[PDB]
Design a binder for this molecule. Structure first.
Ligand SMILES: [Mg+2]
Lengths: 93, 275, 152, 1106, 210, 158
RNA sequence: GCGGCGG
DNA sequence: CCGCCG
């Protein structure tokens, strides 16, 4: 199946939650540029004809692989609705 | 689908309907008909007279008519068992309310009256399984329950407070009225109601949201009456909310998670820097 | 409904056997509907139809077994239910062994040929005693027999 | 190749003319081949005399009906959309009460369709079939009462439909009931009306039934005779005149309602035998002398009192007994509508007898062809009974040419009432194949008829039986009526006979649908052959005796969907009818008389008979079948050859050597592969495609019309407003596309031009045209392009310009263009094949000969059938065919095994043994022994119990081959497959299921104008429906957006679908759908009418969708 | 009239059609009205269907899909990736490039197979009966027309291989894609919602061998 | 593993149990030809005769495979959760015996043959009634179009 | 609209 | 139920 989906499911209080998180994080991956990751140094996802999956394959793939590590935080009401999209564009070319 | 506990935000309603429907294809009273008869509060072919009174039994035999008498010290519920019926309770022992005095199927309504609701429910559920079981099918009771429960989500009114008698309204909507009639605002104007057993079809028929009603029943009347009283359709349920094209109240649409946010420790300290 | 301890036992056991058969037929049914590979074949209609022929026999066994009387009368004189009769044909000296029982107990396979209560030959014998002589109709004609005796 | 057949039941008489049902029906229908002199006056003529002596005094009488000059010929009718009809007039002469009889010797009133030599008709360009029909044979019967288990009721059924439907019930608590049109009245009442007086009546009638007390019931109305006739009128439900308006009574006299079916046998049959005995006239018909005679009414009650009483005979009528069901031959169906037309015509001719001036009226004034043409026309082209001839392959056509349906006029039988009729009844024996019915809804309702089953004088499907007096069997046969079959004791044909005498004491026979073991002295009749028990179609399965009836059906039906393969091969193992099917069906062309061959062109064969004659037979080259299949005739004779009378001159679409062939015989191993033959998958060897083993030719007929708009006639020319020349190449002929051209999806097949955006020139497109080139042809490009999917090679073209030779060009239609496109269908992965036993399946993987299962000697197999599909389904027959088929390979011989009499297990092992000396015999000499591989599998075989331990590998393998299994090395590993595997020559076919019809793949395209839906129809395809069943499916999943996506982004949100498309183009993340145009459209639809539908916020406030 | 026609007499266009002009009421109710529109549903963009064929090798994770179809199915997505790689200078070029199949650059395939990487599609059986009537699979481009389907899920969708045909869809939104492969992928729905029993039960062939 | 007409082995005792039942039928006949058993009882006892005889032959075949051909293709298939159903196997090796008439009342005579051996003309024809009545069900019962899934969805869809 | 047909 | 042809 998928890389430690069980581990993932364990990280959420409800199944469907994981999806929502998974998704929105895949969005922020492309929108604010594709360099907005947290685990690019070693073991960043990869592809087979030319090791280029380092630039742009699947988004969700990343999200999950990122969520698998204790880097990202997810919550009901973590950051002020609008202040988040403002600060993101600022710190990301 | 998994094995751990059900995740909040799952279209159980659906799931139940499906699991119970698929099987329907191989059930040819004996068979599907019975399942219909069962989901639809009805008077089956072979009716079996239930005992409205809970006492003991005594029988009088040999004559064009046989009579089974549930008797106690004060009264006996005379039961006329035609010369062509088959009874299996006999001259002597006790019989609870709503107990098969005749042989065969039972009638929900009567059974609701005598024994009560917690029995009708349990009766349906089981009398349902009874068929699929005999047909190889193995479906969890859960689902038979989910459905059946909706078959008694409505209740009539005998004691009025805000609305008039002769009403047929949502069981829970009444627990809100009576809860806030005794609790918050004083004056105990009890809202005595009578649990109401409705077939699956008529439960749908008389549903509460107007959007939903607009689909099947007459579209004229539904909008007419919803017009008069500025009805506010609180969007809950998949049908109604579909029409809007909005996100389903269930699934990923679950109010529980439709709102969740993601952060990278770098942006969390960055929001703290905006302070 | 009238049964002999023997009769009872037999019908009780048969019922047991048919329960095992129903559980099997069921298992089978379930597998078919689960297969959904080859539909529209005599896979369902047969499995089903088979299970039915069973359940039916079961309803007949439960009915009869749910309300039958037991007549413990091994010491009696006139042919009644449970009585084992023996008839000799005056002419050929043929010895015929039979036992009259309720419709549900009839069975030509038994030691004494168990004949139905409401069975012609069954009717003819009830109410008579050692010595008597009686007739009934038969395709070849009509043969009278004499009750030589009546064991328990 | 030698042909051995193993039949031991002496087939006494040859099968009958298979299409006889249709053929003869129409012959006897319109007795148009012989003079008005010949007797046979049923159908046309009969329906003529029925309503020809018109007595309005007006007297128009019938003379002779003649017709015969076919407007045009067969194919012309097809090439031009013409209905192949003959012209029909008839001499009539109108008489006057004054002196004078003008005879207008000819009034052509209609054009009736004709019948091909094969049996089909050609209505409008296409070939159709008039399928036979069944119903309750208009007679009289007695069926048990509905709910009341007590007594039974009497029925009196007459057709046509307008005629009453009488019933006679008796409810002792107060009435004797006679119902006509749902109202009950005193059975007596009518009786009196006729003359039957209380006294005479009751005494001869109430001999033994106290019930009669129920008739002598009138001590008040029963004392007034002719007054009761008036009394019965009162009875009519509506207020009308007491006297003469006895019309309603007149109606049940001798003309319209009761039936005018042939006097003596039509109804009378159900009379004489079933009840009473004589019929004066035709039906309870008599309005003569002022007094009426109903030698019918009393006996019907006479049998009611008999039935309810004693045993006059055991009168209880089993509805389905074919002795009470008739089959409506085309002739009857057609003749039916004909007299309906006759009536409609006579309707207006009486009107024109009063409008009459004087003696000056005859042809014109009396006759109007209007009614009769619309009539007939309507049948052949509108009736739910004549349809598109299923010609997937000849056999197909032939079945569809002979099946029986229940649904129809509606008076016979409907849809929701059938559990009872659907059953194959006792009587269907040799009259209705018990296997020919179709799966799914409509089962047992529509079925093909039996082998020898032939329709008699009045429809009851008769079957053939052999007479047998004493212990002797004759060569004399009689076609019994279902009913008459019950009177006797017939015996099976499997019964051993030493020549003309029975063979065993305890021999099988069936009394009345009841299995009984009878004695040689009691056998009065014996079965002709097992064949008669099933249908032609069924009679084609090799070892049917070993195949479950349920799957056998799939098997029979399957053959009907077989497709014409270029290389046609007859079954290595046949039933014995293959020859005939092709014969009686007209696929192949036979030699009329003895003689010699002259010319053997690939287009025509000209032979010279020895009788001083020389004919030219043109061969339909490559015609387009109704289903789109190749139909060519390949001569199988050489120049100058002495031909035997009735010898194949050329082979038909699927018949080679005169045998029916549909698919080919391939070597097959019966075992499991990785999973490529999982559920019902079939594996195929590239090696098949190589020798073009499974290749069907196909044709699609695209068509376009040059319509005449009031905006400007649409011209068909090489000119296309969009300026491209590279796409104009193929379209060489000014307007048409060149024959032999390769047309791909999106190419122009034909060019056409019509006028602009309706009425007015666009003021926005007048500035764009003027900037780059004002002189731009104002005409638009509306051209018949290659519809997405495919086309192939253009092979024939048809154009119909102005000066029409003899074609019916619809109105507004300037000229028509037809384009026939073909291609080669090589077998590929998605294609589905199947064997005559019912094993159906699709090709899963096409394997390279390289690594597929091969035998010791280099020979690889062709296909691998998964074994697992054989146990559940019960069709051993195939595993059998395979065994025999195995001998056939090495013995190089085809066999013919009869239905129930075919080859037997011992005899096959016998030929198999022979086969071992060919397979292994050459092996010994060629100079080599046994492989270490062969030994190894033999070990596992002996430990398996297949071989007898202790014998020589030689011996062993033989015994192992005999079982029908040989050894087989993998091919991929070259390692054997532990355990013998059975293999052989199995006859399998490709079905009318190309995957050509299987892959609409949509990205983007057309939307409906009124309703926002991605409908297709052009170069673009439709998107699959999502239905609610499927939404729930999604809902349960909690697939929010996946569902949102379906409802909006992919369908209705015009603007939304847009953003999405763009986004995807940008490699971006699709936009968020805000409001479905359905939401907003609802708000408005609700605003448009009273109701203010207002959307609200958190805190009950406004929000804008717009 | 414009409110509800027919309630009292019926308005007709002048002599030509004695058909009641579809009124507002008529535009809302009925078998095929408007309140019944958004529900019964309609046709999906980015769809397709074909005959199904068993894919032995294939893992329940994946599903066999015909490149040809993939192409069309994923046309837009492909287009973009076309520019990302010099196979084309612009979007319209990519398209003209693909309008004619004789010239399928071998590089395009690389692209298509590149755009599909980790995306999945959905599959549907003839009568959609239970939630598993549609599962999600990772497509792996294959030869031919038929669609390769994993054996183990054959039980889920009442589906055999005697010519049955399934439809296939594509989750466009990265949110749809997600839920698709998370809570809708095959390998994730092993147990049946009907009974806690497995639906990935090994079938006839497998068992037999085992 | 593969099928071959011989792989469907007929148990030697079939010829026995059938014989045992056969004569047994005679007794029942002789008994009514004397007048002992009623018109009905005759019937029911005979069915009982076969109902058991058939069941007997069923375990017989199985016993034959279990003891002599543990690795029989036909057999193995059925044992393994692969394919096959005991009832079916019986129609192969032993015999399918009781097929009912049009209405419902099962047939008096049984289908003495096995599929291995050639099912007789009549036996087949008689067996027909069943298969047709079976397809009948499927036609009505299938096209019901999972109506309940629809009706069920209607109430619990919220 | 009606016939046919696949699962 | 879903689908397709004429
Ligand atoms: Mg199928």
């Amino acid at each position: 199946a998928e890389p430690g989906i069980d581990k993932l499911f364990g990280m959420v209080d409800s199944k469907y939650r994981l999806t929502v998180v998974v998704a929105k994080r895949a969005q922020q991956l492309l929108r604010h540029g594709f360099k907005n990751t947290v685990l690019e140094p070693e073991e960043r996802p990869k592809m087979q004809t030319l090791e280029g999956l380092f630039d742009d394959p699947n988004a969700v793939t990343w999200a999950m692989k990122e969520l698998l590590t204790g880097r990202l935080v997810f919550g009901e009401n973590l950051v002020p609705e609008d202040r988040l999209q403002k600060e993101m564009e600022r710190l990301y070319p | 689908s998994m094995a751990r506990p059900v995740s909040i935000g799952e279209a159980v309603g659906i799931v139940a309907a499906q699991s119970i429907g698929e099987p329907g294809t191989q059930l040819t009273t004996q068979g599907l008909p019975r399942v219909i008869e069962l989901f639809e509060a009805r008077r089956p072919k072979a009716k079996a007279v239930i005992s409205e009174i809970d006492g003991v039994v005594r029988i009088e035999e040999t004559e064009e008519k046989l009579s089974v008498f549930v008797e106690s010290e004060g009264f006996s519920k005379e039961y006329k068992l035609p010369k062509e019926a088959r009874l299996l309770v006999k001259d002597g022992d006790y019989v609870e309310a709503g107990q098969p005095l005749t042989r065969g199927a039972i009638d929900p309504h009567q059974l609701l009256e005598a024994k009560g609701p917690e029995a009708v429910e349990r009766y349906l559920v089981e009398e349902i399984q009874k068929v699929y079981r005999a047909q190889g099918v193995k479906l969890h009771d859960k689902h038979i329950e989910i459905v059946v429960r909706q078959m008694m989500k409505y209740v009539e009114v005998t004691d009025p407070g805000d609305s008039r008698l002769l009403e047929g309204q949502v069981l829970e909507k009444w627990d809100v009225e009576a809860l806030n009639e005794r609790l918050i605002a004083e004056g105990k104007t009890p809202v005595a109601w009578k649990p109401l057993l409705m077939g699956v079809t008529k439960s749908a028929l008389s549903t509460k949201s107007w959007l939903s009603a607009a689909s099947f029943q007459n579209t004229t009347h539904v909008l007419t009456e919803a017009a008069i009283a500025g009805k506010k359709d609180e969007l809950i349920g998949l049908k109604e909310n579909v029409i809007l094209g909005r996100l389903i109240p269930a699934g990923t649409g679950s109010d529980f998670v439709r709102f969740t946010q993601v952060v990278d420790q770098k942006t969390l300290k960055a929001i703290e820097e905006a302070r | 409904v009238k049964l002999t301890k023997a009769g009872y036992e037999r019908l009780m056991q048969q019922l047991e056997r048919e329960r095992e058969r129903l559980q099997e037929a069921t298992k089978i049914l379930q597998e078919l509907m689960e297969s959904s590979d080859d539909y529209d074949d005599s896979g369902l209609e047969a499995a089903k139809q088979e299970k039915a022929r069973i359940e039916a026999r079961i309803d007949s066994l439960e009915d009869i077994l749910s309300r039958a009387v037991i007549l413990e009368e091994g010491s009696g004189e006139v042919i009644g239910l449970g009585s084992v009769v023996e008839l000799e044909d005056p002419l050929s000296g043929e010895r015929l062994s039979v036992q009259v029982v309720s419709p549900a107990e009839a069975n030509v396979l038994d030691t004494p040929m168990k004949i139905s209560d409401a069975s012609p030959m069954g009717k003819a014998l009830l109410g008579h005693r050692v010595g008597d002589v009686l007739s009934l109709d038969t395709p070849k004609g009509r043969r009278e027999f004499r009750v030589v005796a009546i064991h328990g | 190749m030698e042909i051995k057949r193993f039949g031991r039941i002496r087939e006494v008489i040859p099968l009958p003319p298979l299409t006889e049902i249709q053929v003869e029906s129409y012959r006897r229908a319109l007795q148009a081949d012989v003079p008005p002199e010949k007797r046979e006056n049923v159908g046309i003529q009969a329906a003529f005399r029925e309503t020809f002596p018109i007595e309005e005094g007006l007297v128009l009488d019938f003379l002779e009906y003649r017709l015969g000059e076919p407007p045009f010929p067969q194919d012309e009718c097809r090439e031009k959309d013409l209905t192949y009809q003959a012209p029909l007039y008839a001499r009539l002469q109108l008489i006057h009460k004054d002196t004078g009889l003008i005879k207008e010797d000819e009034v052509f009133l209609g054009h009736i369709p004709l019948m091909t030599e094969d049996g089909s008709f050609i209505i409008n360009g296409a070939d159709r079939v008039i399928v036979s029909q069944i119903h309750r044979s208009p007679g009289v019967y007695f069926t048990p009462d509905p709910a009341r288990p007590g007594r039974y009721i009497a029925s009196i059924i007459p057709l046509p439909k307008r005629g009453p439907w009488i019933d006679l019930e008796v409810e002792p608590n107060g009435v004797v009931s006679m119902k006509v049109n749902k109202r009950k009245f005193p059975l007596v009442l009518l009786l009196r009306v006729l003359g039957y007086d209380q006294e005479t009546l009751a005494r001869e009638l109430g001999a033994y039934g106290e019930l009669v007390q129920g008739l002598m019931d009138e001590s008040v109305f029963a004392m007034r005779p002719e007054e009761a006739l008036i009394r019965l009128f009162t009875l009519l439900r509506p207020g009308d005149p007491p006297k003469r308006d006895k019309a309603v009574a007149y109606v049940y006299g001798l003309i319209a309602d009761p039936r005018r079916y042939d006097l003596g046998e039509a109804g009378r049959y159900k009379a004489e035998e079933k009840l009473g005995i004589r019929l004066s006239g035709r039906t309870l018909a008599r309005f003569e002398d002022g007094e009426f005679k109903d030698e019918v009414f009393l006996p019907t009650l006479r049998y009611l009192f008999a039935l309810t009483a004693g045993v006059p005979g055991h009168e209880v009528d089993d509805i389905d007994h074919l002795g009470n069901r008739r089959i409506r031959t085309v002739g009857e169906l057609m003749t039916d509508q004909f007299r309906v037309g006759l009536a409609r015509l006579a309707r207006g001719v009486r009107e024109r007898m009063l409008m009459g001036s004087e003696d000056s009226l005859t042809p014109a004034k009396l006759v109007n062809s209007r009614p009769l043409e619309a009539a007939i026309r309507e049948f052949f082209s509108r009736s739910q009974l004549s349809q598109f001839k299923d010609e997937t392959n000849p056999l197909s056509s032939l079945r569809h040419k002979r099946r029986i349906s229940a649904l129809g006029p509606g008076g016979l039988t409907r849809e929701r009432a059938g559990f009872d009729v659907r059953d194959v009844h006792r009587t269907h024996y040799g009259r209705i194949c018990p296997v020919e019915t179709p799966e799914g809804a409509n089962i047992g309702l529509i079925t093909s008829l039996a082998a020898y089953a032939r329709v008699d004088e009045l429809g009851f499907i008769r079957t053939p039986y052999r007479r047998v007096v004493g212990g002797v069997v004759t060569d004399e046969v009689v076609y019994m009526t279902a009913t008459e079959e019950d009177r006797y004791t017939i015996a099976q044909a499997n019964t051993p006979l030493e020549g003309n005498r029975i063979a065993a004491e305890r021999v099988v026979a069936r009394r009345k649908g009841e299995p009984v073991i009878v004695s040689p002295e009691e056998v009065e009749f014996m079965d002709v052959s097992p064949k008669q028990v099933f249908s032609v179609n069924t009679n084609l399965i090799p070892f049917l005796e070993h195949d479950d009836a349920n799957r056998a059906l799939m098997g029979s039906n399957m053959q009907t969907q077989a497709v014409p393969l270029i290389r046609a091969q007859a079954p290595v193992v046949m039933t014995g009818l293959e020859e005939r099917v092709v014969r009686d069906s007209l696929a192949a062309l036979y030699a009329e008389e003895d003689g010699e061959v002259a010319k053997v062109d690939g287009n025509r064969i000209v032979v010279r008979y020895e009788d001083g004659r020389l004919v030219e037979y043109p061969l339909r080259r490559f015609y387009r079948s109704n289903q789109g299949t190749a139909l060519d005739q390949r001569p199988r004779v050489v120049v100058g050859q002495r031909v035997r009378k009735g010898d194949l001159l050329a082979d038909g679409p699927a018949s080679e050597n005169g045998f029916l062939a549909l698919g080919q015989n391939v070597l097959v191993a019966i075992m499991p592969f990785d999973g490529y033959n999982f559920e019902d998958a079939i594996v195929i060897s590239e090696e098949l495609l190589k020798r073009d083993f499974y290749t069907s030719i196909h044709i699609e007929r695209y068509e376009i019309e040059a319509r005449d708009t009031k905006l400007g006639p649409e011209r068909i020319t090489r000119d296309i407003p969009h300026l491209s020349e590279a796409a104009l190449r193929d379209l060489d002929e000014e307007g048409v596309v060149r024959i032999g051209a390769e047309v791909k999806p999106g190419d122009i097949l034909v060019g056409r031009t019509s006028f602009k955006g309706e009425s007015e020139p666009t003021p926005e497109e007048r500035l764009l045209r003027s900037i780059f080139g004002e002189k731009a042809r104002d005409v638009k490009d509306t051209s018949l392009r290659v519809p997405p999917g495919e086309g192939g090679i253009v092979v024939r073209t048809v154009r119909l310009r102005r000066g029409d030779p003899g074609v019916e060009l619809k109105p507004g239609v300037r000229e028509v263009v037809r384009v026939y496109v073909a291609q080669k269908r090589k077998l590929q992965v998605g294609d589905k094949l199947a064997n005559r036993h019912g094993n159906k399946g699709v090709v899963a993987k096409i394997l390279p000969v390289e690594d597929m299962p091969h035998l010791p000697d280099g020979t690889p197999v062709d296909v691998i059938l998964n074994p697992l599909g054989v146990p559940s389904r019960m069709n051993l027959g195939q595993i059998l065919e395979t065994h025999l088929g195995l001998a056939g390979y090495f013995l190089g011989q085809r066999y013919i095994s009869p239905i129930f009499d075919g080859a037997k297990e011992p005899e096959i092992k016998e030929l198999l043994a022979q086969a071992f000396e060919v397979y292994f015999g050459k092996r010994k000499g060629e100079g080599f022994g046994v492989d270490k591989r062969e030994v190894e599998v033999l070990r596992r075989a002996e430990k398996l119990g297949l071989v007898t331990p202790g014998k020589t590998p030689e011996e062993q393998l033989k015994e192992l081959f005999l079982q029908g299994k040989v050894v087989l090395y993998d091919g991929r590993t070259g390692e054997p497959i532990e355990g013998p595997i059975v293999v052989g020559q199995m006859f399998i076919m490709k079905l009318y299921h190309m995957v050509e019809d299987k892959m609409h793949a949509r990205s983007t395209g057309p939307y409906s104008l009124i309703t926002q839906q991605p409908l297709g129809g052009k170069a673009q395809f439709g998107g699959q429906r999502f239905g609610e069943m499927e939404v729930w499916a999604l809902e349960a999943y909690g697939a929010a957006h996946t569902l949102q996506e379906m409802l909006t982004l992919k369908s209705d949100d015009i603007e939304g679908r847009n953003a999405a498309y763009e986004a995807i183009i940008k490699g971006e993340d699709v936009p968020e759908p805000s409001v479905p145009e359905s939401f907003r459209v609802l708000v408005k639809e609700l605003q448009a009418l009273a109701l203010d539908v207002q959307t609200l916020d958190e805190k009950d406030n406004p929000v804008d969708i717009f | 009239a414009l409110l509800d026609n027919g309630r009292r007499g019926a308005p007709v266009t002048n002599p030509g059609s004695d058909r009641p002009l579809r009124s507002l009421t008529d535009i809302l109710s009925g078998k095929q009205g408007r309140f019944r529109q958004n529900l019964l549903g309609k046709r999906v963009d980015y769809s397709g269907r074909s005959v199904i064929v068993v894919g032995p090798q294939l893992k329940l994770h994946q599903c066999g899909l015909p490149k040809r179809m993939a192409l069309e199915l994923f046309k837009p997505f492909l287009l973009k990736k076309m520019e990302e790689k010099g196979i084309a200078p612009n979007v319209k070029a990519a398209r003209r490039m693909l309008e004619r199949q004789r010239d399928i650059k071998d590089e395009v395939w690389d692209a298509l197979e590149e755009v599909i990487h980790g995306k999945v599609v959905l599959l549907n059986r003839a009568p959609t009966l239970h939630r598993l009537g549609i599962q999600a699979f990772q497509p792996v481009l294959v030869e031919g027309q038929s669609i390769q389907l994993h054996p183990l899920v054959c039980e889920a969708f009442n589906a055999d291989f005697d010519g049955d045909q399934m439809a296939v869809h594509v989750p466009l939104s990265s949110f749809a894609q997600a839920e698709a492969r998370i809570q809708m992928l095959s390998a994730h729905n092993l147990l049946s919602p009907a009974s806690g029993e497995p639906l990935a039960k090994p079938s006839r062939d497998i068992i037999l061998g085992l | 593993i593969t099928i071959g007409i011989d792989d469907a082995v007929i148990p030697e005792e079939k010829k026995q149990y059938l014989e045992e039942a056969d004569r047994k039928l005679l007794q029942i006949e002789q008994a009514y030809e004397m007048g002992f058993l009623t018109d009905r009882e005759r019937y029911d006892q005979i069915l009982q005769l076969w109902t058991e005889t058939t069941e007997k032959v069923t375990q017989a075949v199985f016993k034959n495979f279990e003891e002599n051909y543990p690795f029989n293709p036909l057999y193995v298939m059925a044992q393994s959760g692969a394919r096959g159903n005991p009832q079916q196997i019986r129609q192969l090796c032993g015999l399918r015996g009781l097929m009912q008439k049009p209405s419902g009342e099962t047939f008096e005579v049984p289908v003495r043959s096995s599929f291995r051996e050639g099912l007789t003309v009549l036996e087949y024809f008689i067996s027909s009634h069943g298969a047709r009545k079976g397809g009948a069900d499927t036609a009505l019962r299938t096209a019901d179009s999972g109506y309940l899934t629809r009706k069920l969805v209607d109430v619990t869809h919220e």
